[PDB]
Amino acid sequence: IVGGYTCGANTVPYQVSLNSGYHFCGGSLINSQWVVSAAHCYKSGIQVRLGEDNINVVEGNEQFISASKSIVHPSYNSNTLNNDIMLIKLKSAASLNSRVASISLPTSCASAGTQCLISGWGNTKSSGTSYPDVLKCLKAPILSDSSCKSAYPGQITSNMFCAGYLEGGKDSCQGDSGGPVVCSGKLQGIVSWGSGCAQKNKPGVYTKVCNYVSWIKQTIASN
Ligand SMILES: CS(=O)(=O)c1ccc(C(=N)N)cc1
Numbered sequence: 001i002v003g004g005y006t007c008g009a010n011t012v013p014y015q016v017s018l019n020s021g022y023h024f025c026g027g028s029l030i031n032s033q034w035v036v037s038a039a040h041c042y043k044s045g046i047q048v049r050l051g052e053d054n055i056n057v058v059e060g061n062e063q064f065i066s067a068s069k070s071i072v073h074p075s076y077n078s079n080t081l082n083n084d085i086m087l088i089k090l091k092s093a094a095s096l097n098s099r100v101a102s103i104s105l106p107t108s109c110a111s112a113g114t115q116c117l118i119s120g121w122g123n124t125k126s127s128g129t130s131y132p133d134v135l136k137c138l139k140a141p142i143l144s145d146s147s148c149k150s151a152y153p154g155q156i157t158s159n160m161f162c163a164g165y166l167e168g169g170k171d172s173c174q175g176d177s178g179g180p181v182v183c184s185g186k187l188q189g190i191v192s193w194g195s196g197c198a199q200k201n202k203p204g205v206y207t208k209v210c211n212y213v214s215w216i217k218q219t220i221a222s223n
């Protein structure tokens, strides 16, 4: 997260870190046994880490649970990043509390102008590299589809939306991938892609979760 602020320990209870010997992507807990992330974050041997703040220091509120199965969206396209979403089932149910909680799925899509909360342990610089150890937060509005399409000609599908600032300076970044975009207490997006980070006229592009509620629900009900 570039241009954000320190969230505060466990203030984003649904945020999870995907670990494969090191943090490589974020994710969101949607129930005691399932996590939603980005399809481009796929890999084998994933351990889900919940209740984390400083990913390099065990503070006492963490829960480390291995993944039992990963399900990438059937129509995921790695070249265009269309349908960049995947589900991860935990080997065992997480213990839910005030510091580890699930985030509700949306019943309707969020409209442009709505303010959302984006979070992650990704790079904090637009130029250079600096990874924080604690969770960073960023409040950003959803942009109109017209401004999004104008920023990325011929690259935005109906399953994507832009959020951020056209002026640049504030945006999600490498390492925040798979992370949540929460608006009005509902999960509306997944950190997916963008050109660089916090660049002028290049806002972040996010997976539009509201288009996948049916797939998510039916998949969880049969696996
Ligand atoms: C490295 S990545 O493709 O995951 C990526 C993730 C986020 C952004 C940001 N501009 N919103 C840019 C790139």
Ligand SMILES: [Ca+2]
Pocket (backbone or CB within 6 Å): 052, 053, 054, 055, 056, 057, 058, 059, 062
């Ligand atoms: Ca920790």
